[PDB]
């Protein structure tokens, strides 16, 4: 019973890796050998955001590149302005432990997560003037890890019990749920077209999920340890992944295998959160040894090093117009970095 | 340019009222001391939360000792894979670990407890955090030794070749065998804590009861020891 099944599974995975090896006509870095190198790229701390009490776990930019949400471990979710360093809202959370925050594209809502498996959405209309909890979603068993808005009607969430659902806020139920993972799903990265997203679990397998169909299309197993964070390319035809084996990886949806591997001998520390730039040429990496490494996505070479943090670079964000890059660490200092 | 500077005015007034509320919550959050409560499912850590008092993922307990506020965070309906969310609790003041002892039982739980303590201890982000130890079910250890056979000596060949330490003082009305068992468990967990030898954090061992009132005062005393040792480190005295 189980053994013939697992043998057929192994022959299928041999078929898939025959496919993958047939497809591999050449490598991308041989292709990129007659390409102008970017060179040393310096970025400086234009602003420092302060007034956070505990460590800053996750943060998310707005679509007008003006207001950022920052999520902290003191129970304070702060809506910031990046230009004038003004806290344009400060929101007190029920649970003190937070692992994610999302900011809506219209800016009407902020969503917050944590260890109490409840995704809490806050409205920002403020007709009375006091921010209030607009709704609490509770349908996950594992801890809520990273949750991301498609629009103001549908929020997609990543639990800790290897499940990812698609929530409707109006019904307050789960529209579709899928459990295709074997390890703990850390974070998901939505598409710019929002028809697909990619999730990074802890079984070293990145998954490509159709939102409307409700099942995976592709499985990627090129890593060696836990996939911490995942980020889509700006065209939506590729993604990047960061792991704990100190290697960043770039993946293709069409080739169905890894294009490039980003690895340096001197740094063996883990890779927290990775965000592309607007053009896609710089991959930006939040390492665990207190700095951000600016990889060249086509040449696999460190442009430049953002060693302005005292503690580990917990998460890394990039505006939609590519203007500045905001990094949140565990020393409660959020840096806005500009080239 | 009048409306613009008025909007800047409005943002400045709201930033003032926010940074007031921030400073008040900074006061109240430096008042607060945070205690992560970790124990296995065989161990009666529901009994220890019932003591501490007298569907969600995390359960939170607030109690105050000598006008000093404590929050104890009890892991609840969570998954067995515990490493990805153990990173959160480096910011807490101290981590209370409660382990059962059954020596009369499907598998060895003592070894699992030792392995979990070792993984807590040698973890990178959990180096700066102190761990406070409760060895539960001592009465049951007493009652179960007199069964004609001993589990621990089977599971541990070192316990045949072991003698009770002379500096430690057993309580009266106790069997020298049962106290040998107690002290040898305590020695196992302290050899695991002394193995690393970092000197940033220590392991505070306690022998408790099924029904006991004194636990809140022991956690208060070990808190006072942890912040005294932190100040001794901090001024480079030790």
């Amino acid at each position, epitope marked *: 019973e189980l053994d013939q099944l697992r043998q057929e599974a192994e022959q299928l995975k041999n078929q898939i890796r025959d496919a993958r090896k047939a497809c591999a006509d050449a490598t991308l870095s041989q292709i990129t050998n007659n390409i102008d190198p970017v060179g040393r790229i310096q970025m400086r701390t234009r602003r420092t955001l302060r007034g956070h009490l505990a460590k800053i776990y996750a943060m998310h930019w707005g679509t007008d590149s003006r207001l950022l949400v920052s999520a902290s471990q003191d129970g304070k979710l702060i809506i910031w302005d990046s230009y004038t360093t003004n806290k344009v809202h400060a929101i007190p959370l029920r649970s003190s432990w937070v692992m994610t925050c999302a900011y809506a594209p219209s800016g009407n809502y902020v969503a917050c997560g944590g260890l109490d498996n409840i995704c809490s959405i806050y409205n920002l209309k403020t007709r009375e003037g006091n921010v209030r909890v607009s709704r609490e979603l509770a349908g996950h068993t594992g801890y809520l890890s990273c949750c991301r808005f498609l629009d103001d009607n549908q929020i997609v969430t990543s639990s800790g019990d290897t499940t990812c659902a698609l929530w409707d806020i109006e019904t307050g139920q789960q529209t579709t749920t899928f459990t295709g993972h074997t*390890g703990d799903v850390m974070s998901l990265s939505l598409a710019p077209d929002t028809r697909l997203f990619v999730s990074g679990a802890c079984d*070293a397998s990145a998954k490509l999920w159709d939102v409307r169909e409700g099942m995976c299309r592709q499985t990627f197993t090129g890593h060696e340890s836990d996939i911490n964070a995942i980020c889509f390319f700006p065209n939506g035809n590729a993604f990047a992944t960061g792991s704990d*084996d100190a290697t960043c990886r770039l993946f293709d949806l069409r080739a169905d295998q890894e294009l490039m591997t980003y690895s340096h001998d001197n740094i*063996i520390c883990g890779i927290t959160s990775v965000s592309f730039s607007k053009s896609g040429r710089l991959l930006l990496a939040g390492y665990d040894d207190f700095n951000c490494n600016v990889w060249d996505a086509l040449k696999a070479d460190r442009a430049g090093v953002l060693a302005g943090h005292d503690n580990r670079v917990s998460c890394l964000g990039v505006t939609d117009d590519g203007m500045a890059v905001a990094t949140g660490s565990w020393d409660s200092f959020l840096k806005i970095w500009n080239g | 340019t009048e409306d613009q500077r008025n909007e800047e005015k409005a943002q400045r007034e709201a930033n003032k009222k926010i940074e007031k509320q921030l400073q008040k919550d900074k006061q109240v959050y430096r008042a607060t001391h945070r205690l992560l409560l970790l124990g296995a499912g065989e161990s009666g850590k529901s009994t220890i939360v019932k003591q501490m008092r007298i569907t969600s993922g995390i359960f939170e307990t607030k109690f105050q000792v000598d006008k000093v506020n404590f929050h104890m965070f009890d892991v609840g309906a969570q998954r067995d894979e515990r490493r990805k969310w153990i990173q959160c609790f480096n910011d807490v003041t101290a981590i209370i670990f409660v382990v059962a002892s059954s020596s009369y039982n499907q598998t*060895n739980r003592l070894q*699992e407890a030792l*392995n979990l303590f070792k993984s*807590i201890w040698n973890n*990178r982000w959990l180096r700066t955090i102190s761990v406070i130890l409760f060895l539960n079910k001592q009465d049951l250890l007493a009652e179960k030794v007199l069964a004609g056979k001993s589990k621990i000596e*089977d599971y541990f060949p070192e316990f045949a070749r072991y003698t009770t330490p002379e500096d430690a003082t057993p309580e009266p009305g106790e069997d020298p065998r049962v106290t040998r068992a107690k002290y040898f468990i305590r020695d196992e967990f302290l050899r695991i804590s002394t193995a690393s030898g970092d000197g940033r954090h220590y392991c505070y061992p306690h022998f408790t009861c099924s029904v006991d009132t004194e636990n809140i005062r022991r956690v208060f005393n070990d808190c006072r020891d942890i912040i005294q040792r932190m100040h001794l480190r901090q001024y480079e005295l030790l």
Partner: nanobody
Amino acid sequence: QVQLQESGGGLVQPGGSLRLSCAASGFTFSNYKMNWVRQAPGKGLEWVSDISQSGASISYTGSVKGRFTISRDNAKNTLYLQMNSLKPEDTAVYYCARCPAPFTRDCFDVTSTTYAYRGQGTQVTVSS
């Protein structure tokens, strides 16, 4: 792809000798602390034993201590377990495991709800 293939085992006699092998494919072998873990019928997983990157430090579980040899070759990329003096009370599935992070001393691989860095494991039966 992290993949683990255990090898040897089967129906044996008490007091005999048996080798287990673990072929560790799909990663760099020297970076990771690696371990053996076994599973009794109708019982839970229990940590047999452990081995670091260089292989200098080795500990065991007491109840079977001194009875098993854990050799990792870095070159051959295999992990061999040497058994002798077999006891009937210890008849179990056996599983080769890897700790998930490189260059670290901590491990969290006791979870039985589909831990994904272990092999399929081998049945090892003692009949007296």
